[PDB]
Every structure is written in C-alpha cells, then in structure tokens.
Amino acid sequence: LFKGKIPFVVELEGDVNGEVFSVRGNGWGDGSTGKLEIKFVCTTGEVPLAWESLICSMALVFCKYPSNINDFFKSTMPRGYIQERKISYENDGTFDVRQEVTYENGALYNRVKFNGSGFRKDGNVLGKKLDLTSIGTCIYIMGNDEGTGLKGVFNKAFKVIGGNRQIASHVQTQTPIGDGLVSIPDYHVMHNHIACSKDPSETRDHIIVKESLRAVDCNTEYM
Amino acid sequence: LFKGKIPFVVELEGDVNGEVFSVRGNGWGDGSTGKLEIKFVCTTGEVPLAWESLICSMALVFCKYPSNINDFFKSTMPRGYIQERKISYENDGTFDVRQEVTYENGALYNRVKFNGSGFRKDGNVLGKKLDLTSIGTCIYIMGNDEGTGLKGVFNKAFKVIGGNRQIASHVQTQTPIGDGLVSIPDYHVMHNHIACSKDPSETRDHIIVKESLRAVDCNTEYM
C-alpha cells in the first residue's frame, strides 16, 4: 500500500491548558522513500501554542524500512495502529496524545486527540518561542515487553527563538487496531528530519512540514 | 593531542546502594578515527551490579568530530572538563556520576565518582541481567543556556538477558576544568557503538569494551 506517494490527511482536536482548537492537514507520504509533505491549517482560528509542539503528534508508517528490520507500522495496515505519547517539556507542561493511524479510501489518516496541561504562562510553548526550521531527531523503536506492540523514547531539542534549546522528552507506544498478524521488531532507531515553513501568501494560521524518515539498524550502522 | 592512538586510563570509585567497589581500565582512544578499546578490571573483587550500567560512565573527547561542528571536548584539553550525569532507569534506581576528563603525561584519564541509590533487589541492575554485546546509542550534544559549557540527553536501550529492553535516561553536563578559551557547539548528535566481551582466559571480574564515536550534523545528515 506504501510503494509510492499516497494522500496523507491529519485531523487534530487539541485542548491545551483548556484552550480548544482544531487542525486539518493535507499532503502526501511515500513509505518507499520515507518522505512526506503536508500543510497544517488551524480551522478554529489560531493555535494557542507553538506549532512546533504539534508537529510529531501530526505517521511513522511512512518511514523507509530496510528489509532486515520488522516494519510494525506497515504490518498493521490497512486497519492500522494506536500511537500514544506522553511528552514532557523541561521546566514546562506535559502533552497526553492519542492517535489513530489508519489506511482508508486509498489514504493514510492520522486522527489525533492532543491534550496538554501544566504549561507555564511565560514558557516557550504558550509563548510560541520554538522553531523547527531544519532539525534532525533520533527516535528509539522496539518491541514492548509482551511482544504485542511497540514502545519508544526520544528527545526533541527544539530551537528556542532568542534562547538556546528546549528538550521535550517523549515516551511512545504503538498497538495494532485490528486482530491481524503484526510484525514486532527488536531495538532500532529512526533518523528523522523536519523542515517547517510558512506560506507568506497564505492568510490562515498554518505551517508547512517536510519530514524525512529512515529506520536504522544502529547496532550495525553506528560501528 | 588526539591525532592518533593515545593511552586511555580509567579510575572509577563506585558506591551503589552502599556497595563500594573500584574499577581500573587501560586501553587506547583515537580522536581522529573516533575508536577506543579498553579492558576494565574490578580491583576490589566483583562489581556488585551490571557491568553494562558502568560503561558510559567509564571519554567523548575521542569522538570523531567533523570540521563544521565545534568540538567542545578537544577544545578543553589538556586541562580538560567535568562530565556529570543523572542516569534514571525505568522501574529502577538512579546513578549520580561525576567525571574528571584530563590529558596528563601523554594520556587521557577518565576519573569517575559513580554513586547509585534506590536500586531494586530483583531489578536488572543489581540482578546483572543487562547486555551490551553490540548496541548503537544516539547522544544529543548542545551548548548550555549560558554558553560556558555543554548539556546533553540520551537513552540507552539495554538488552535484558531473558527479558526485552530496559531504558536508562541520561541527563549530562560538561564544564571546562580550566580558564582557557573553549569552543561551544549548537545542537548535534553522536552516533556511538558499544561492543562488550569477556576474556575467558582472564580470571578477575572484568569487561572489554570497544566504542565507535562520531559527531553528526543530524540537522543536515537526517534530510
């Protein structure tokens, strides 16, 4: 299903320190090259927080997997998987995020419930002081202890506009939505790249995201 | 000072859940290739915990740095730097670690105070149920907020013998020991590899470690 560009559609309902907002993204992902491009629009007016804080919540199924690592994400399709994260910001609040990642009508949908609490008034998140202009991130992927799904961990070192860097710590799980046979990997990493940009022509609150995604047998490739 | 193999000497005084032990390592590191080899011996009898839990505490100065990233570690030599870590194990205790990394008499010394508390009796650390046979780790390196030193973060996904994987979360700082001019980088990563082995000939409690260390401009290389 993932040999070639396919539509990538995102629906995020957000609730951060009791500020409710909706985001819709349309673009494309290519699971054989590990590339995607998508434009996110806030449909309820303006995001009450850093766009950058939304980006990883808004499709690791598009990751370019080598043939020697089990690709859990593609193995669950078309029914797909649940992707859940706790994201903890150094000196700031916490996001609780639940995603349904499914293949429907020839398209990959990321449907996201994005909740945040404890965020600080003069913090980088509510202050919108974060930047992902061009940034590499390494994500740890492995089988959960029961061998029914995935767990993972990673940091993002967000650029802080007029500051230094802000670490957000992510804990993730992925569990299949269906009862079909799934493929469980051992420990590996994703080398991921984000570039975020704004259309100066566009008048609505939005952000354009390009990602690169590659699964890496770091146990071999780091030697 | 780091163009070619030079002696690498480690002295670790350890205190884990009130169990005191000493480790001495001798080997070599090569800062131009980013390789090192060292054999660690417990001099007080036996390590009262997983060797694997000691390995990253027991010389990022040996990291192969490209010319487009500031190499803080080599910029501090010969006086060298302090390297401090809090290491937190999922469902287990915490290590507090202070290192002095100095160049003395043509050799690179890592002098380590390794403290651990809250470790669980039937846990993977005191139970010695961890393995680093062949494992890749990605370390985040960046300038601290004051621009006087480094901060960093990383996970190690330890193999658990007869289990799955155990995440240890590391927070690190590096601060110069001297008053000399130091070179402060922006965010990048190290792709590091560990291979641990035992000499079946050797009769003392020991472990042999080979590391690969490369500094990576992930903001470019992950695209």
Numbering used by the authors:
A (entry chain A), B (entry chain A): 7 to 64, 68 to 232
Share the article's original sentences:
AausFP2 has a distinctive cyan-blue pigmented appearance when expressed in E. coli, with a broad absorbance spectrum peaking at 610 nm. Every Aequorea CP displays a broad absorbance spectrum that lacks the well-defined sharp peak and short-wavelength shoulder typical of most FPs and CPs, suggesting that these proteins contain an unusual chromophore and/or chromophore environment. X-ray crystallography analysis of AausFP2 revealed a conserved dimer interface geometry containing many conserved residues between AausFP1 and AausFP2. We suspect that despite AausFP2’s behavior in gel filtration experiments, the native oligomeric state of AausFP2 may be a dimer. The amino acid residues making up the dimer interface in the AausFP2 crystal structure are also largely conserved across the other Aequorea CPs, suggesting that if this is the native oligomeric state of AausFP2, then they are all likely to be dimers. The X-ray crystal structure of AausFP2 further revealed a chemically novel chromophore in which the side chain of a neighboring cysteine is covalently linked to the methylene bridge of a twisted GFP-like chromophore. This amino acid, Cys62, is conserved in all Aequorea CPs. The C62S mutant of AausFP2 appears yellow and has a major absorbance peak characteristic of a GFP-type chromophore, strongly suggesting that this conserved cysteine is necessary for formation of the red-shifted chromophore. Quantum mechanical calculations indicate that both the presence of a sulfur atom and a twisted chromophore are required to produce long-wavelength absorbance. Because of its broad absorbance reaching into the far-red and near-infrared regions of the spectrum, its relatively high extinction coefficient, and its efficient folding at 37°C, AausFP2 or its derivatives could ultimately prove very useful as photoacoustic tomography probes for deep tissue imaging.
